[PDB]
Design a protein around this ligand. Structure first.
Ligand SMILES: Nc1ncnc2c1ncn2[C@@H]1O[C@H](COP(=O)(O)OP(=O)(O)O)[C@@H](O)[C@H]1O
Ligand SMILES: Nc1ncnc2c1ncn2[C@@H]1O[C@H](COP(=O)(O)OP(=O)(O)O)[C@@H](O)[C@H]1O
Ligand SMILES: Nc1ncnc2c1ncn2[C@@H]1O[C@H](COP(=O)(O)OP(=O)(O)O)[C@@H](O)[C@H]1O
Lengths: 375, 375, 375
């Protein structure tokens, strides 16, 4: 609180907002992106509740609330709800006066121009920021990495991409999309557990299943052989206590759930699994740069956090590639916050501080400015 | 009683067993699935009563008895009780020697493998059937229909499903579940009648309320406008004589009870009403097959028997679908026995007689056989 | 069905088989070249479906099926699938007995010798044709035209060529290749529509986009000025109803998609646009024959069907050529079937009937015969 200034790095996630100050090593505020007020709301004797805050309160308030994601699939679809999320971010989580900070916002891949313009309009008109930037989330991640060359497999919450990069450039024609990512894997685990006679269907039960997924699932060494071991499997049958206190047993569901990344037909997806899309992406590049891609396969995103994933990807890529090809899979430790960190590096870039968009630019060429000939 | 043979078609319902001979047009035996013996049992001077027969005796014996459904929510949960129901089916209702007849059994959606194996074990070991098949009840219904394409709304006793079908295949990812169906509507009518100062709480009173529901409830043309007419409603106020002989008056409860299918929040269900689930199911299918689904919405199940339901579904679907979409609701007349009829067609399928499971198959690969690579 | 005979003219296209009788004015059978069976195949209650017929059934059966082209990029790559396509052609579409008809087959430019030999082996051994010929598809088209001199721009489905011709001879060193053609333009329209927030990614969605391309795209008068008019463009914003019934709006995508033929960098292609390749081809010819080429630029192929293409080519060629050069663009009306018609003329050539290849020639010098010293 003086001269200088930082850069409000707000990564608008499909399920979680990550926000903080440029220059910090990780976001200081992480809260669910949802909207929820009592679904039954039966009055009582007073009030003192906040209608649709969701954020952190919701979670801990599981069972009372309803949820909505105004950013459900990564694109913002409800501007009144999004204004509530940004107000919460600035005033309740970070506890800042937004008019004192240049703010860098992230946007999903393929975000419409008109959507970026509405984001810009809200920042300047509603929150009175002195400036702002919009950054592409994949791009920020790439930034955080620091690798000019290599092929990234980025699997997050709602989408997975394979992005080959040569000298810093995402050759746009190589990238392929997959709908599936963590949101789909949590829904599939709810369904397969419901196969055993359990019942996980409510909003609260979804949260419970997301926790089982993140704590007990793993990727097999070989799907077929893991299924065969399931028979005499005395390991798989882990126990998990529900908040009600009942204890369920989870066995082959531990590896059947994430097997979907390699076999999208488990959820009905025709798409090619992540090892096939990696190969298909490398084959859309020049033959010449393929050796550099094969030796620099970088994993990113929350859904690449499973133990065993790098070894499995090494095995599968080795099976598809030429016999003399050197293959290397890199996974950065704390991948998931790779998107926020790239934003932090960019926003905290004094040297490129002219890329921030300003109140004068917005007034001159409206918000589009932050879209036409920059970010 | 000679060569050839029929197929024992036993549809194990949550509230009613439907059983008969393959090839008959409808089941010859329909009896409540319950277990009940005197709750007070005060001896007397002799016996000559059957402990927990339930079946038909129970009903007519209302007030003395207790009830249990070993198939309460569609999945068999008590094998000693289920053995009693099957013994009653074979020896008391159909009056057959089960060792002379291949028998097709039905099972609920999501029935565990181990449950199908126990059903199979009992048929072969306890009843000595020469063969048997297990069939999926929804599937049998689909079979009875005869429509390859279209979206079915099947509302029965304990569950309602929306199932889109293209060339005979239930695209498994499109189907959505609802807990609510007729069991819930009877419980809700007991509760709302208890609001007027009446008291319907016992087992006998539940049966009385199920009769009021089936004889006097109806679905409104528009819920809001029907409530508004309730004021000057001189029609609604129908009379119903209780077995005690008192006469109650039923008015807006006639349409408030089934309104729950369209507004599950009436019983506290967050779920989306049946018109919303229909739309949500069609939107999980390819855009291309949607025109075929919209023109082939087939209603099935006992809870789709209300007069007015097809016209209301036509109105609601028209309001959600594109303006140029051709919408058609089909309701087969005697829907409820749609499940038994599909079983009868399948079981009575000489041409597919190799799908029946045999005593040799059970002995070789145990009962699982009737589960792994068939039904 | 008597003496004489016709010539089975089968044009094996990358996406469509065109087949018929020599002497007919157009092919009587046109069906997609694909292979597809249920991707989900969920059994049901019977069969009566044909595993991977594709042909016409597929299309109308959009959403159920998968596709494969055994001729994906013009060269046949799977002989078991190709045998199915030829069986369908003869027995289901044309309804002929192939052993009664000399059959002329077409092959892509640069088809390997061994591939032509395998085509020949199948015709004689599998279908028992009395004779057969293999013809080069470009060549057949040239044949259909009837112009000895001039430079043809032939843009079809998977490839575009510029072919200068002087007295009937394709000076082989002048011809240049382009990967891009209609297959690429359909993929690019799917991608650019997905930019607006729509989602066209499935096999069924590809077919939908191919229809939007063929019905609503057009080539601009000037790309830069058309983009500038897009702003106040109230024309562009045509509506298109999807099979689901939703209605999308298409605007600048109408001309951005085919702009790729003139600017291959839109899809990442370094190649020179079709006006530059025309000029580059004319400059590889003698200076002396250039006046004849400039006055005889003939358009051929499905991708030259856009309204406005001849006028745009006249404008662009005029801008590159010497000021006193007479420039004329010819487009034959029903260009696309230009390949089949050339085959029909050739095959129906009684006078050159000795060029057909016979069962004795195949037996003597194997199939190669139809390759070494003829077609
Ligand atoms: N340790 C972990 N193991 C597996 N999945 C994880 C782990 N940590 C986070 N995830 C999942 O990663 C997803 C979030 O990843 P993220 O990269 O932030 O996604 P997005 O950027 O698409 O919002 C969620 O589905 C979450 O459950
Ligand atoms: N005419 C009717 N009107 C309304 N509900 C009916 C009618 N006939 C039967 N039902 C109800 O339908 C339900 C039984 O339907 P059914 O399809 O057999 O269910 P399930 O297969 O789930 O056992 C019961 O709740 C019953 O009261
Ligand atoms: N009227 C049209 N306008 C634009 N493209 C068209 C038209 N008719 C056909 N096409 C396209 O032309 C291509 C087929 O042309 P064709 O000459 O048969 O190709 P090929 O011989 O390479 O198989 C397809 O991409 C198709 O969509």
């Amino acid at each position: 609180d003086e001269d200088e200034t930082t850069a409000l790095v707000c990564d608008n996630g499909s399920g979680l907002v990550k926000a903080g100050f440029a220059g910090d090593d990780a976001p200081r505020a992480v809260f669910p992106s949802i909207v929820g007020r009592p679904r039954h709301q039966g009055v009582m004797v007073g009030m003192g509740q906040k209608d649709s805050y969701v954020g952190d309160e919701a979670q801990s308030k599981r069972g009372i609330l309803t949820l909505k994601y105004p950013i459900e699939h990564g694109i913002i679809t409800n501007w009144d709800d999004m204004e509530k999320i940004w107000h919460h971010t600035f005033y309740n989580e970070l506890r800042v006066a937004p008019e004192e900070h240049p703010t860098l916002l992230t946007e999903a891949p393929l975000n419409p121009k008109a959507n970026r313009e509405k984001m810009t309009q809200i920042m300047f008109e509603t929150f009175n920021v002195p400036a702002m930037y919009v950054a592409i989330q994949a791009v920020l991640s790439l930034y955080a990495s620091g690798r000019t060359t290599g092929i990234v497999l980025d699997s997050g919450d709602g989408v997975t991409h394979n992005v080959p990069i040569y000298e810093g450039y995402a050759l746009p024609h190589a990238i392929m999309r997959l709908d599936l990512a963590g949101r789909d894997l949590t829904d599939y685990l709810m369904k397969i557990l419901t196969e055993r006679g359990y019942s996980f269907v409510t909003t609260a039960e979804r949260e419970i299943v997301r926790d089982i997924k993140e704590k007990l699932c793993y990727v097999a060494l070989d799907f077929e052989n893991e299924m065969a071991t399931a028979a005499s499997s005395s390991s798989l049958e882990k126990s998990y206590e529900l908040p009600d206190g009942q204890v369920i047993t989870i066995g082959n569901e531990r590896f059947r759930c994430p097997e979907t990344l390699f076999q999208p037909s488990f959820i009905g997806m025709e798409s090619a699994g992540i090892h096939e899309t990696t190969y298909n992406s490398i084959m859309k590049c020049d033959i010449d740069i393929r050796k550099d891609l094969y030796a620099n396969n970088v994993m990113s995103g929350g859904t690449t956090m499973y133990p065993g994933i790098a070894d499995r990807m090494q095995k599968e890529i080795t099976a598809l590639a030429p016999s003399t090809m050197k293959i290397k899979i890199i996974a950065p430790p704390e991948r998931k916050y790779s998107v926020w960190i790239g934003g932090s590096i960019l926003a905290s870039l004094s040297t490129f501080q002219q890329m921030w968009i300003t109140k004068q630019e917005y007034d001159e060429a409206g918000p589009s400015i932050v879209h036409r000939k920059c970010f």
